Amino acid sequence: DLDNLKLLELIGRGRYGAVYKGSLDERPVAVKVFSFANRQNFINEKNIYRVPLMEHDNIARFIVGDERVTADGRMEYLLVMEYYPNGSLCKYLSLHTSDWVSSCRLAHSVTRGLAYLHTELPRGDHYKPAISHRDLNSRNVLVKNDGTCVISDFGLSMRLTGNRLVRPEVGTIRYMAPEVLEGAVNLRDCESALKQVDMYALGLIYWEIFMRCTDLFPGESVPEYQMAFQTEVGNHPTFEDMQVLVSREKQRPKFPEAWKENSLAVRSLKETIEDCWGQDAEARLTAQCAEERMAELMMIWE
Ligand SMILES: Nc1ncnc2c1ncn2[C@@H]1O[C@H](COP(=O)(O)OP(=O)(O)O)[C@@H](O)[C@H]1O
Ligand SMILES: Nc1ncnc2c1ncn2[C@@H]1O[C@H](COP(=O)(O)OP(=O)(O)O)[C@@H](O)[C@H]1O
Ligand SMILES: [Mg+2]
Ligand SMILES: [Mg+2]
Ligand SMILES: [Mg+2]
Ligand SMILES: [Mg+2]
Ligand SMILES: [Mg+2]
Ligand SMILES: [Mg+2]
Ligand SMILES: [Mg+2]
């Protein structure tokens, strides 16, 4: 198989992998390359992808993983996966504005993938545990050519149910929930607490998506894309910065005045976003309810 793998241009990178466009048996792929220092994230990500029943319309498609020794005497680990020309949701939102229906399509498809990730499927030979993503954000979501999302980057994800479990501030700082910023996640109910951390981050993703919805800025132009909290903390905020703004001061991204609350759809959208990122983690929507709320919003478009 992998003797015929060709790497082309670099298309992305984060803390753990450098991601290249590639060719495998003359078909296009993406190749995430890890150094030996990040081997454990490769191991983790590969094994999450190989958990039974992980193939799903809103989960990135994994092909194969592999190791090689480089010319200069270094170990490299390669995670080969489907190539998504649109890239991350972050990149896609910076380039596109969408109307109500297509914005809901982005938001619903990412929510559907998270609800599936979060759901335990007792199946013996095919057991799928509930899995927490642990760094959910729009750079770890990819956008398919048909305009729907897939969840990606399981380098930090953890199994939450079943046997041989372990108990664990390692995510992306901008998207950390308040209880994480306080070091006070309730690890006694570990399964629920980790899902609630994910759900807070999904709320921020909702805000980022709908800030680029052409129908929410009528008679006006859509603001340029900005990540959650960028106007308030800039790029690369510090842990302490986020702690004061998000947890101490109880702040969240702001809904524009242009979302004048006389529309029933807009009022409902705002309440669903707020039900995801509230301070009381036990009171946030679950992923399965957010998926249903999102679909019910679309249905309240008639
Ligand atoms: N299969 C893919 N197709 C297209 N772009 C990708 C793909 N996987 C990752 N990327 C891009 O590479 C970036 C980093 O990939 P990711 O797997 O998140 O690495 P890290 O674990 O280092 O954050 C993503 O934000 C995205 O822009
Ligand atoms: N069919 C099953 N598949 C997966 N996990 C199961 C099944 N039945 C029970 N369990 C769970 O597996 C756990 C046992 O894990 P084990 O590896 O024995 O210990 P630990 O997780 O403490 O290291 C129990 O808490 C139980 O809830
Ligand atoms: Mg990263
Ligand atoms: Mg490692
Ligand atoms: Mg695992
Ligand atoms: Mg990433
Ligand atoms: Mg935050
Ligand atoms: Mg429900
Ligand atoms: Mg909607």
Numbering used by the authors: 199 to 366, 376 to 509
Tell me, in the authors' exact words, what the paper reports:
Upon ligand binding, bone morphogenetic protein (BMP) receptors form active tetrameric complexes, comprised of two type I and two type II receptors, which then transmit signals to SMAD proteins. Here, using hydrogen deuterium exchange mass spectrometry (HDX-MS), small angle X-ray scattering (SAXS) and molecular dynamics (MD) simulations, combined with analysis of SMAD signaling, we show that the kinase domain of the type I receptor ALK2 and type II receptor BMPR2 form a heterodimeric complex via their C-terminal lobes. We further show that the type I/type II kinase domain heterodimer serves as the scaffold for assembly of the active tetrameric receptor complexes to enable phosphorylation of the GS domain and activation of SMADs.
Two sites of PAH mutations—D487 and D485—stand out because they make direct interactions with residues in ALK2 in the C1 dimer model. D485 was not included in our initial mutagenesis and was of particular interest. The D485G mutation is highly penetrant in PAH, and previous studies have shown its dominant-negative effect on BMPR2 signaling in complex with other type I receptors (ALK3 and ALK6) in cells. When the D485G mutation was introduced into BMPR2KD (BMPR2KD-D485G), the recombinant BMPR2KD-D485G did not dimerize with the wild-type ALK2KD. This mutation also had a dominant-negative effect on BMP4-dependent SMAD signaling by the ALK2/BMPR2KD-D485G full-length receptor complex. The BMPR2KD-D485G structure revealed an intact architecture of the kinase domain and overlaid with the recently reported structure of the wild-type BMPR2 kinase domain35 with an RMSD of 0.5 Å over 279 Cα atoms.
